[PDB]
């Protein structure tokens, strides 16, 4: 079952996931939109600095040159 | 004043076809061997006679 | 890009990303800002004049250029 | 427009690669792409600690490649 | 493209801060399509060093962090394609 | 790219259903935006317009960074800015506090 | 293609010295160079950042990690630079 | 070197034709394999494929390439009519066989 | 000193002699009248802007005696030193020796093969292999030089024989097969196979400035259309290989019965069409062809006669002779590499001597060893100038040297002077 | 010869225990099982886990989508 990453990001859009960036900080939120260039838009996310909560910020557009990876739960 | 001329190539082909009697069928200077101006000048300077040439 | 056609043969200073200094005669450039400089001197900060000669600089490590001296005869 | 790198001289030879964070690796070159991604057979690890770990057939992305070194004479 | 917007703003006394923290105060002269900025009347205050005077400056467009524009610039008539 | 057409209006459909549409509401509804950028700075203001490279124009901004002594956050006012798009971590529409 | 790449192809066969992003200076005879700055070099004297001098006989440098190159001085009479 | 030019006797033949005056060529390599497929881009064509191999003026243009002066030219100056010897080739080439003695003299 | 205008600086030629990897020592030879001196004329006109051929006569830049001008044949082998660019754009130093092709002056070629490393054999495409070509293949192989073959006068396949394209291909292939046979008869080395696939055979017309291998014409395709690997595309333009226009691939079987070979389809028929549209159709369809190939001519340039106009069109189309430089760089060794068989064959006492290992490195400093083979006269005829090559060391103006004759030994020491 | 995308295709055929290295991150490496790739070498992992070099605490990651601009070495076991 060959599952490419592009139908993975266009198929599971809407699930509450967490993105992790290059600096090591983590965004908990559900994915709103994603393009073919793999920029991402997620809503009402939460900020974990090294697993520790910092504060409330809002909904985030994330760019290609900032993200490390995208995992679930 | 009627000094210079330039034609097209079918014109030159037709004028070359009509003039086929006054022209030779030669293609190269392998003809005139020992029968050109320099050989005649050499036979002039050496006082000998080429067969067919002048005296 | 005629603003660099005006800068031809000038004795120009070049600042790198690490903070070093390339001073050379502006011989040639391209679209990727790759420099051909002749009779080049390197300045770093303790100050020292480090003679190089003919330098081909890659555009990925160049920040900003400025003009120091007129073209010699 | 992306021309492939001329790595025909280094085929099936033992080469050591340098990677970004002072990293070092060795092995046999087996091919390339026009993006300079390299396939390496018999890949031993050889980190900065000093202990050697063989892996096998691996792929190095070209963006972290610093330098090639041909240990065998090409 | 906004970079084509940037070449419509010649001869304006703006400041440029780069990715190294260096600040440049001067009148902008030329903008390339790759944001290669050609500047004159340069007051260049480098980070943790002394500010200097320069006559002609040429900044490569990749290392630009941001620009700072004065108060009297009517951009509402300048963002028209 | 498999779309070589000259009539290229996908980049504004990118601005409507894609990820960049976050900025277009701040173009249209004129909301406050917060920007975290690469040398750890926080820029709060109002963006006017932008492109696919996120080269943005901002107005009436306050930008903050901390200094180390021990880290204390300082702030400064700038009336208008142009911001290059590769010089950001994140762009943030500020939520409805109400 | 522009002028500095043609100057790079002209310096093949002579002795050049390159410094890359890891601060290492490699001096020796340039063998091959492409449109991009992938440089195949041989008979290389190697100066690290600390100061150790090494001898490496076949080096292939990726052009992405290169800071700059230093060329011979007799290339100021090359045809593309005149 | 011997000019090997062959005259055209039929206007309906093609200009480039294997004339049987020419001796026949007695008919009989590291070629790569088909599987390493080198594909050209779609708009790449051989040069000048719209123009034909020959036209009606080709063989005449080849025949005028070996014509004597002035029939190999296409531009020149006019000459005054008494300076054109029409018989100079005739006594310049050789003597034909079978002529009498006074003709040779 | 005064010098004619040259496209390169003379200081560049002065500084290029110091690197023995960028120098090639080439001898051009062949049978009588197959196009050597006109090829040298084309190279000289390539390097000099102010030297141009007359519209009616040949130039003959390297025939400097009056006997060669009155006889029309070559008598003395003449050297020339130029700087030429290749396909990739890199400049190279060429020392070219033009030797006569007449058999009774074969001694002028043997004096030329002693001071050089490579042989370029010119062969007439119409006549083919002749007597002196067959003798010079043997004489160039037994003297242990590299051999490349250029097939000159291909337009005699077009404008004299009026020959069909596949028949001209068969003529060229028969010439190359006879050359490979004459190589394999006298050689014991099997790595001397000559073929255009290896970049080893060139094609040329000296009268109209045509010179190409497969790689240069592939570079012409790459400059015209773009995004084509020319070094891979040039590997399939010879032999029984066919272009299939449906799949756009190169297959070894015939798609149709009218399918031509790749060399006929991509190279030889555009050459026929260029020559045909210049010669036969200058008046009607030549501007359409010159607009199609991307060549612009002045209105005064269109009013020329047929042969200078064909030379001008082929010179604007093909341009610089980069394929010849590619062949002479790829298949003729530098004097730094090929010094060892030269010292092994030409130096008495063997290469295993103490001085032989010093000369085998081509060291520009150290012991001076030069070998002069040719003597040239001045204008007055009162004194001669020696001509040779420098095997080792560096010779200086004003340096006292020792001249050793052909009767000198270490035992005698009589035939020597300072 | 071997090109790297055919070996990534062989990796997704073999579903091997692929350990991925990272750009500029000398300590933190990730074990995983590859499923698919793309033209810019973005890689999904079925059961990914994080292994440091000074801490070495194995934490669960699940099916991740690691980008192309971060990876250095795709090694096995
Ligand atoms: N048709 C045609 N004739 C040519 C070509 N190249 C040379 N010739 C002619 O052939 C004749 C002899 O050319 P040269 O170059 O003098 O012959 P050569 O090889 O120097 O003779 P050597 O003195 O033995 O060296 C001249 O009339 C040239 O114009 C060519 O490409 N095509
Ligand atoms: Mg000659």
XYZ file of C-alpha atoms and ligand atoms in Angstrom, chain I residues 31-38 60 62-63 72-75 98-101, ligand 2:
20
model
C 48.527 12.578 -49.291
C 49.204 15.331 -51.849
C 46.438 17.925 -52.348
C 43.973 16.782 -49.713
C 43.504 20.100 -47.839
C 46.214 20.672 -45.222
C 47.322 24.247 -45.894
C 43.753 25.486 -46.409
C 48.075 29.919 -48.476
C 51.794 28.917 -44.499
C 53.335 28.665 -47.989
C 51.306 25.101 -56.181
C 52.639 22.212 -54.075
C 54.168 22.109 -50.619
C 57.946 21.867 -50.368
C 52.116 21.604 -41.781
C 53.959 18.968 -43.780
C 53.874 18.418 -47.561
C 51.941 15.517 -48.997
Mg 49.828 22.013 -48.951
